[PDB]
Amino acid sequence: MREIVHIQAGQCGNQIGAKFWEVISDEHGIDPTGSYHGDSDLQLERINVYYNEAAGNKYVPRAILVDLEPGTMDSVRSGPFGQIFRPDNFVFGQSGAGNNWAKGHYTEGAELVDSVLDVVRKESESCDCLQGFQLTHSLGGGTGSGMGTLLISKIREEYPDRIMNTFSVVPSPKVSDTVVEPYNATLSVHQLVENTDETYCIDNEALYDICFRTLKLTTPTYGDLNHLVSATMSGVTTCLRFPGQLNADLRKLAVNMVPFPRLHFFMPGFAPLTSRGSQQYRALTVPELTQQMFDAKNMMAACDPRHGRYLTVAAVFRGRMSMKEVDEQMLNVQNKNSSYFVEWIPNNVKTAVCDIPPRGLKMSATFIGNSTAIQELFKRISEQFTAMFRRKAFLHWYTGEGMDEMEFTEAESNMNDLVSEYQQYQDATA
Amino acid sequence: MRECISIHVGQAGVQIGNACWELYCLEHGIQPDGQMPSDKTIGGGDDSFNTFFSETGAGKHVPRAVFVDLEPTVIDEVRTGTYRQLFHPEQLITGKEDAANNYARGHYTIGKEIIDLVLDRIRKLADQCTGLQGFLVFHSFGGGTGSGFTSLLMERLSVDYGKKSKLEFSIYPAPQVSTAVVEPYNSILTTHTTLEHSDCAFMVDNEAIYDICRRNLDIERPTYTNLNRLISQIVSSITASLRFDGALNVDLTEFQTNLVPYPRIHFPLATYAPVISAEKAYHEQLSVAEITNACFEPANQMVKCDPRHGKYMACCLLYRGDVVPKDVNAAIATIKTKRSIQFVDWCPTGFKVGINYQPPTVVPGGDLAKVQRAVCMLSNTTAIAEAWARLDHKFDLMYAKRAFVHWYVGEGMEEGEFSEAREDMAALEKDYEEVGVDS
Amino acid sequence: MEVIELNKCTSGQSFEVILKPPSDPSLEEIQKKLEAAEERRKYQEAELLKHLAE
Amino acid sequence: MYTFVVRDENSSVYAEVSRLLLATGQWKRLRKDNPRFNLMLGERNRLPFGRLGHEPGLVQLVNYYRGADKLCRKASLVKLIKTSPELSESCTWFPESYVIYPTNTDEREVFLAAYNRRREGREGNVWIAKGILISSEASELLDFIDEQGQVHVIQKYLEKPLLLEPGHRKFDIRSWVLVDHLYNIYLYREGVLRTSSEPYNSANFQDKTCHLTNHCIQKEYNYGRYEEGNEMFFEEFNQYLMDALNTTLENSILLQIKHIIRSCLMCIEPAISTKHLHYQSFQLFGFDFMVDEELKVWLIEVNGAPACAQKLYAELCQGIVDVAISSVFPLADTSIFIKLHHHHHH
Ligand SMILES: CN[C@H](C(=O)N[C@H](C(=O)N(C)[C@H](/C=C(/C)C(=O)O)C(C)C)C(C)(C)C)C(C)(C)c1ccccc1
Ligand SMILES: Nc1nc2c(ncn2[C@@H]2O[C@H](COP(=O)(O)OP(=O)(O)OP(=O)(O)O)[C@@H](O)[C@H]2O)c(=O)[nH]1
Ligand SMILES: Nc1ncnc2c1ncn2[C@@H]1O[C@H](COP(=O)(O)OP(=O)(O)CP(=O)(O)O)[C@@H](O)[C@H]1O
Ligand SMILES: Nc1nc2c(ncn2[C@@H]2O[C@H](COP(=O)(O)OP(=O)(O)O)[C@@H](O)[C@H]2O)c(=O)[nH]1
Ligand SMILES: [Ca+2]
Ligand SMILES: [Ca+2]
Ligand SMILES: [Ca+2]
Ligand SMILES: [Mg+2]
Ligand SMILES: [Mg+2]
């Protein structure tokens, strides 16, 4: 009734994208066949935000699956919720993008993009009132990063008055040794600053450190990293999918979260942090959730929030608990750390409560923060980029696909401009 | 008998309208289906309640009401709820997508594509009216629709109904239940734009109401339903003289005369007592003196502010229940000696009193206890400017950095509309200070 | 002190007690305002599409 | 962790209170426009009382009582005493006084009414203006008033002051009064006499290093002769009243002082009390008294932002913290004040 079209791109995009559909499909009681078997009408009231209905009261994700190689899409197709996705919404090439932004954005990806738009268009046309698009992808490879940003540009051309949202996985050398990731990610960030409204920065640095240091997993796998992504995605989309007042559509979230059009990069956090499988036996009290969701160690972006100031925050508490105690605790964090919240945006913290908890938990909290400390993320990428770029290293892979050095220089500059704007507001004062 | 049309705009306006017409129906013994056993002129008449209801040959009483929202969820609840039959489908107008908490989107962008339709549905009510006096408009200051579309609508009713009166019921934004950080921006924008078009406006600060609910109804965390039931009693109290026989405030014109000598200063403070929880086992019934005296407690006001530090230009007391003038006069005598009540020099120090013998009606299973006697004081006091001050300060903080402004520019509004709206409020706070303070 | 304008009826009564005496836009101009805002949105949108085209 | 903000840099007293609060390590100071404070120490002008008590989750307290200015401007004080029946024109501890404006309300004519029954009794007829001049001659003040610009006060001058010996000196008494959030009225046990240093010259009024007892106007013209800084404290002045007059401070003066303080503040309690309000106030006042040769006490003025005297800062500021603030915001884990209460039954 206010529909969202979801797109997932590349290996990473499709991996987390699949996990997201598994998790939410279960929260809304949909099963692999696409049949509702839940026991609550809360589950269905806003089901049309993410699912189309079908013959036999069937629910079908409004989800387009994109990759330049077939590999992962056969892994999607024959995973648990593989059957649920609409088969003509699988759009795949044959060659792959070889971790190369330029191929995904300018050569190999441009061949495929028209067919993805045809599928987007067919999905946009059956929509009573389309709100926008959410894209899942990594920024360190070639398809999700290069082709993903190409798509975004093209969708905004056809739907310039719809909201664009991404969950963008930021690369880290603690997780990948592919040497051109900083290039691919600086080029993507350039696109993102210009053409999205909200971006969830999901930093592989942070997910790895959480797995290792806090969940005591000595050999984290992508499965462990993605469990954290899917929990966060479940949490940050709760207000869109369940009945509610605050940030209940993409536009309203954006208005609440983005004071300046370029500063739309969000830090998500989650409490309690869990590892897959192992159960959690104690429920958290509302104070523990509050203290934890705001903890640096619970952030999915590896930035220290005490190094910045929060422009805006949204908090979402899930489960059966006292709204009185939540308001009190929410108020106590701000009044006890008020200097970390910009005083020139009054009442910048907003709080929602959904009665349905996530599977496996009695109580949970998701935090979405637009903080100036995210600049640490962009500096880090920028340092890694510069170390290579100043010797023009690895550039032949990009110039061989038509690109000029100028395009790298513009991108580095735009990301350095972004970083300094965060700084500007960090320092501001009334 | 002259008719009145109620326009309810955006979620807050609609939900509060819902609450008011439920109460109006219980007060005049009108049932959910619209039938009124006590009404003996079947198919028409010019009784006092007909100011708010029109009649059909089938014996059916229907609100002189129009609900408008730019999204449909909330007006759908009206369409399928207990009072579904009361209203005609043409009175309930909805859009597809809402103003997203943005005045500009509600004024300029979505306003355009729906204003003409709404004016037309209003005109269909005004043509069942032998002698329309004007409109009561209900909205939030902070919503996109509530602020942006209402101000556009107000501009248009001035044009298509120039000689008609317009009263507002306006919800002033409170962080404890607000849904947008831009509520200050919208609130100033819509105030600037609506000020010349409004004759008398009754503000209700959600903060005041929310606390009255915690403090006096023992509600751990008030919902809109709690808030709105309380608000609807105040409104009902205010409108009672239009819907019942009496000689005070019998028409919209009289509200302006009795409450608003200086036109821009048209924001009377409402104070209400007593508010008593229905769960309270033992309640000692409050006297006339006691509830009158409670009218000068800030804790009972619709807006928290301190009238001791301003001046009055007018004051009405509206009593419901077992009350006689003798008691009111004695209560006012003791209260004058005990309290700080300074009128402006160019006004008589007095009170206009209205007694309606029927005690307040409460919604069954509501949170409010039935009481023998209640009162609602309406006072035009410069103390209310404190609410303007608060809202302006917050606007200043944000606008100094241009935070969020791009969202408004992006809908076609010019930045300079911000400073112009803010200049108009600066002058407003100036007018309240000239009137209210000396040295 | 001094009660006045006492009015009584079956439903209630009213009176005044006095303790102390004293001592606009046209339909046109609107359609315009809305139309200028809309042009401003069309220009903003055209500049973006111009940019996407480059 | 309680929090607070400071909006008057120039306040001797609240400078000290900041320091004392910080030093508990349970108070954190904020930047002056951060709205999320328990406590404001406010500016002297256009303090935004209208923005207080609307931050949820915070009990809020301010160090001024909105409305107390009516006590503390000479114009308003004079007005308050005549007009308030609890005080009245009968009032015997305030000097006969009159509000007068330039000609650029007024009660000039009514001033004359009394001026020409002292010139028709040939007795004392010295008056004082409010930049400040004493004269026997009406028009030398009236023409002095219009020629200055502001609204002023004319007040019977006290021709027969009590004089200290050695010195034949003049003085005023300054008492510090703290009113807390419950409207407890606390009189600080230490007060101070602000002495003249130069024998009280009766028949000449220009040489004003003897007629005015202001700490600043003594300095900048025998300063330090009989006592440090022209400040006699109470042990001393009591002792001197014992020796020289056979009485005590308590009996001859302090009862009148307590009485005068109570009456002034009870008078305005209904207009300024914060008892039922959404924010809470307290305030330190300085009351200024004259004493005549008969040991009759007269109220001169009330100061809404008084400064303390050097020796006493420490003890007073500690006591402000103890009773005004930590009563509202308790810490974990010898009373310098005398509480003014009195319920006589009639
Ligand atoms: C050699 N690089 C290591 C690596 O790629 N390790 C791989 C690794 O740990 N991988 C690929 C995990 C992923 C999965 C699915 C898994 O099943 O292990 C991590 C990165 C999440 C692997 C498979 C070569 C052992 C890495 C962890 C990035 C590393 C970086 C800095 C310092 C030390 C180790
Ligand atoms: N008292 C009260 N306040 C409400 C209610 N609903 C919303 N509000 C308040 O009104 C403001 C939000 O405005 P809404 O009326 O929701 O906005 P709208 O008019 O629907 O505007 P859009 O959704 O932006 O199109 C906030 O201050 C809310 O607390 C209600 O039922 N009662
Ligand atoms: N009626 C009167 N009779 C005798 N002396 C008087 C008087 N009125 C004022 N004085 C003297 O003049 C001095 C200064 O007057 P006043 O105290 O009113 O001015 P001020 O407010 O600038 C100083 P402060 O604020 O500390 O009291 C007094 O301390 C007193 O010595
Ligand atoms: N968190 C997470 N990161 C991934 C996953 N798969 C790949 N990555 C990261 O994504 C980047 C590689 O992009 P990939 O999606 O594999 O390239 P593409 O398929 O061409 O888009 C590197 O930063 C990898 O560490 C995953 O499943 N989860
Ligand atoms: Ca090819
Ligand atoms: Ca094609
Ligand atoms: Ca009838
Ligand atoms: Mg791959
Ligand atoms: Mg709405």
Query: Ligand 3: which atom is nearest the Cα of residue D194?
Result: 29
Distance A211 CA to ligand 1 centre (A): 13
Q: What CATH architecture is D1-63?
A: 3-Layer(aba) Sandwich (3.40)
Tell me which residue of A223, A224, A160, A145 sits closest to A191, measured CA to CA: A145
Q: What CATH architecture is A1-259?
A: 3-Layer(aba) Sandwich (3.40)
The answer to whether the CB of A218 is under 6 A from ligand 1 is no
The answer to whether the CB of A175 is under 6 A from ligand 1 is yes
* Cross-strand pairs, A269: A299, A367
Beta carbons of C52 and A157 less than 8 Å apart:
yes
Which of D71, D132, D214, D287 for mutating ligand 3's site (highest number of atoms within 8 Å of CB)?
D214
Chains contacting B (3 or more CB pairs within 8 Å): A, C, D
- The DSSP bridge pattern shows strands D283-291 and D297-303 to be antiparallel
Phi-psi region of A301 (alpha: psi -120 to 50; beta: other; left: phi over 0): beta
**Residue D184: partners with Cβ closer than 8 Å, 6 or more residues away:** D323, D339, D341
How many residues appear in chain C?
A: 54
Closest-CA distance, D47 to chain B, in angstroms, reads: 12
Does A11 show up as a binding residue in the annotation?
Answer: yes
Class of residue B174 by CB neighbours under 10 A (exposed 0-12, middle 13-18, buried 19+): buried
CA dihedral of B209, B214, B218, B223, whole degrees rounded to 10: 70
**Residue B188: partners with Cβ closer than 8 Å, 6 or more residues away:** B391, B392, B395, B421, B422, B425
* Cross-strand pairs, B236: none
Q: What is the largest CA-CA distance in chain A?
A: 61
The answer to whether the CB of B12 is under 6 A from ligand 2 is yes
Query: Which letter, b or e, does each residue of D249-280 get, where b requires 16 or more Cβ atoms within 10 Å of its Cβ?
Result: beebbbebbbebbbbbbebbeebbbbeebbbb
Nearest CA owner, ligand 3 atom 22: D214
Q: What is the DSSP string of A284-347?
A: PPHHHHHHHHTSGGGBSS---GGGS-EEEEEEEEEES--HHHHHHHHHHHHHHSGGGB-TTSTT
Phi-psi region of B267 (alpha: psi -120 to 50; beta: other; left: phi over 0): beta
Query: Given CB atoms, is D30 within the 8 Å cutoff of chain A?
Result: yes
Beta carbons of A344 and B398 less than 8 Å apart:
yes
Compute the distance between CA of residue B396 and CA of residue B63 in angstroms, rounded to an integer: 41
Q: What is each CA distance from B172 to B146, B165, B184, B339, D205, in whole angstroms?
A: 11, 22, 9, 28, 61
The answer to whether the CB of B225 is under 6 A from ligand 2 is no
Task: Please tell me which of the candidates A129, A255, A324 has its beta carbon nearest to residue B221.
Answer: A324
- State the alpha helices, DSSP H only, in A141-221: 148-158, 181-195, 204-209
Tell me which residue of D196, D233, D235, D192 sits closest to D212, measured CA to CA: D196
B384-439 domain in CATH 3.30.230.10? Answer: no
CATH number at A374-430:
1.10.287.600
CATH number at B1-268:
3.40.50.1440
Which residues in chain D are classed under CATH 3.30.1490.20? Answer: 96-159
Q: List the catalytic residues of B.
A: 254
Residue ranges with CB less than 5 Å from ion ligand 9: B 11, 98
Q: How many CB atoms lie within 10 A of CB D83?
A: 10
Q: What are the structure tokens assigned to B192, written together? A: 């600037």
Q: What CATH architecture is A260-373?
A: 2-Layer Sandwich (3.30)
Q: After which residues is chain D broken (C to N over 2.5 A)?
A: 104, 130, 221, 333
Which residues of B line the annotated binding site? 10-12, 15, 71, 99, 140, 143-146, 179, 183, 206, 224, 228, 252
Chain A residues close to B406, C-beta within 8 Å: 260-261
Chain C CA closest to residue B48: C11
Contact call for D and C: 3+ CB–CB distances under 8 Å: no
Helix (H) or strand (E) holding A27: helix A10-27
Distance D154 CA to ligand 3 centre (A): 12
Phi and psi at residue B328, to the nearest 5°: -65, -40
D96-159 domain in CATH 2.40.50.250? Answer: no
Tell me which residue of B176, A324, B210 sits closest to D56, measured CA to CA: B176
Nearest CA owner, ligand 1 atom 34: A174
* Cross-strand pairs, A90: A65
The answer to whether the CB of A174 is under 6 A from ligand 1 is yes
Query: Given CB atoms, is C19 within the 8 Å cutoff of chain B?
Result: yes
Phi and psi at residue B429, to the nearest 5°: -65, -25
- State the alpha helices, DSSP H only, in B103-171: 103-104, 110-126, 144, 150-160
CATH homologous superfamily for B269-383?
Answer: Tubulin/FtsZ, C-terminal domain (3.30.1330.20)
Which of D134, D150, D212, D217 for mutating ligand 3's site (highest number of atoms within 8 Å of CB)?
D212
Query: Given CB atoms, is C37 within the 8 Å cutoff of chain B?
Result: yes
Beta carbons of A327 and B221 less than 8 Å apart:
yes
Query: Ligand 4: which atom is nearest the Cα of residue A175?
Result: 25
The answer to whether the CB of B110 is under 6 A from ligand 2 is no
Phi-psi region of A190 (alpha: psi -120 to 50; beta: other; left: phi over 0): alpha
Contact A272, A292 (CB under 8 A): yes
Q: What are the structure tokens assigned to A236, written together? A: 């940050």
How many residues appear in chain B?
A: 439
Q: How many CA atoms lie within 13 A of A100 on its CB side?
A: 20
Q: What is the DSSP string of B382-415?
A: GGGHHHHHHHHHHHHHHHTTTTTTHHHHTTT--T
Query: Ligand 1: which atom is nearest the Cα of residue A211?
Result: 21
Compute the distance between CA of residue B201 and CA of residue B150 in angstroms, rounded to an integer: 13
Q: Could you list the beta-strand ranges (E) of B23-76.
A: 53-55, 61-63, 65-69
Q: What is each CA distance from A333 to A289, A294, A340, A341, D333, in whole angstroms?
A: 11, 9, 10, 10, 24
Q: Resolution (in Å) of the shown entry?
A: 2.5
Query: Ligand 3: which atom is nearest the Cα of residue D158?
Result: 3
The answer to whether the CB of A11 is under 6 A from ligand 4 is yes
Q: How many CA atoms lie within 13 A of D302 on its CB side?
A: 26
How many residues appear in chain A?
A: 430
Chains contacting C (3 or more CB pairs within 8 Å): A, B
Which of B140, B169, B394 for mutating ligand 2's site (highest number of atoms within 8 Å of CB)?
B140
Q: What are the structure tokens assigned to B422, written together? A: 């803010």
Ordered by start, the domain boundaries in chain A are: 1-259, 260-373, 374-430
Beta carbons of A256 and B181 less than 8 Å apart:
yes
Start-to-end CA distance of chain D, whole Å, equals: 48
Distance B11 CA to ligand 9 centre (A): 5
Ordered by start, the domain boundaries in chain B are: 1-268, 269-383, 384-439
How many residues appear in chain D?
A: 346
Nearest CA owner, ligand 2 atom 4: B12
Query: Given CB atoms, is B336 within the 8 Å cutoff of chain D?
Result: no
Distance D212 CA to ligand 3 centre (A): 6
Chain D CA closest to residue B174: D54
Q: What CATH architecture is D64-95+160-346?
A: 2-Layer Sandwich (3.30)
Method of determination?
A: X-ray
Q: Is the peptide bond before A173 cis (omega within 30 degrees of 0)?
A: no
Phi and psi at residue D188, to the nearest 5°: -75, 135
Query: Given CB atoms, is A161 within the 8 Å cutoff of chain C?
Result: yes
Angle at D48 between CA D44 and CA D49, to 5 degrees: 100
Which of A7, A8, A12 for mutating ligand 4's site (highest number of atoms within 8 Å of CB)?
A12
Q: Which of D86, D274, D277 to probe by mutation at the B interface, max B CB count within 10 Å?
A: D277
- The DSSP bridge pattern shows strands D171-179 and D283-291 to be antiparallel
Class of residue B111 by CB neighbours under 10 A (exposed 0-12, middle 13-18, buried 19+): buried
Class of residue B82 by CB neighbours under 10 A (exposed 0-12, middle 13-18, buried 19+): exposed
The answer to whether the CB of A232 is under 6 A from ligand 4 is no
**Residue A197: partners with Cβ closer than 8 Å, 6 or more residues away:** A132, A163, A164, A165, A250, A254, A258, A264
Phi and psi at residue B340, to the nearest 5°: -95, 100
Q: What is each CA distance from B415 to A223, B141, B152, in whole angstroms?
A: 49, 20, 18
Q: What are the structure tokens assigned to D126, written together? A: 């010295």
Compute the distance between CA of residue B136 and CA of residue B228 in angstroms, rounded to an integer: 17
Compute the distance between CA of residue B123 and CA of residue B253 in angstroms, rounded to an integer: 21
Chain B residues close to A345, C-beta within 8 Å: 181, 397-398, 401, 403
Query: Which amino acid would we find at residue B147?
Result: S
Phi-psi region of C33 (alpha: psi -120 to 50; beta: other; left: phi over 0): alpha
Tell me which residue of A150, A159, A70, A153 sits closest to A110, measured CA to CA: A150
Q: How many CB atoms lie within 10 A of CB A144?
A: 35
Which residues of B line the annotated binding site for GTP? 10-12, 15, 71, 99, 140, 143-146, 179, 183, 206, 224, 228, 252
Query: Given CB atoms, is A125 within the 8 Å cutoff of chain C?
Result: no
Tell me which residue of D225, D110, D208 sits closest to D167, measured CA to CA: D225
Q: What are the structure tokens assigned to A93, written together? A: 């090439």
Query: Which letter, b or e, does each residue of B308-341 get, where b requires 16 or more Cβ atoms within 10 Å of its Cβ?
Result: bbbbbbbbbbbbbbebebebbbebbeebeeeeeb
Helix axis angle, A181-195 to A405-426, nearest 10°: 60
Task: Please tell me which of the candidates D31, D33, D36 has its beta carbon nearest to residue A335.
Answer: D36
3-state helix, strand, coil in chain B (%, to 5): 45, 20, 35
Q: What are the structure tokens assigned to B71, written together? A: 């999204």
Q: What are the structure tokens assigned to B260, written together? A: 């608003």
Task: Please tell me which of the candidates D54, D56, D271 has its beta carbon nearest to residue B308.
Answer: D271
Beta carbons of B439 and D49 less than 8 Å apart:
no
Beta carbons of C49 and A161 less than 8 Å apart:
no
Q: What is each CA distance from D173 to D284, D298, D302, in whole angstroms?
A: 16, 10, 12
Tell me which residue of D129, D69, D125, D134 sits closest to D101, measured CA to CA: D129
Query: Which amino acid would we find at residue D102?
Result: P
Residue bearing tokens 């701000």: A334
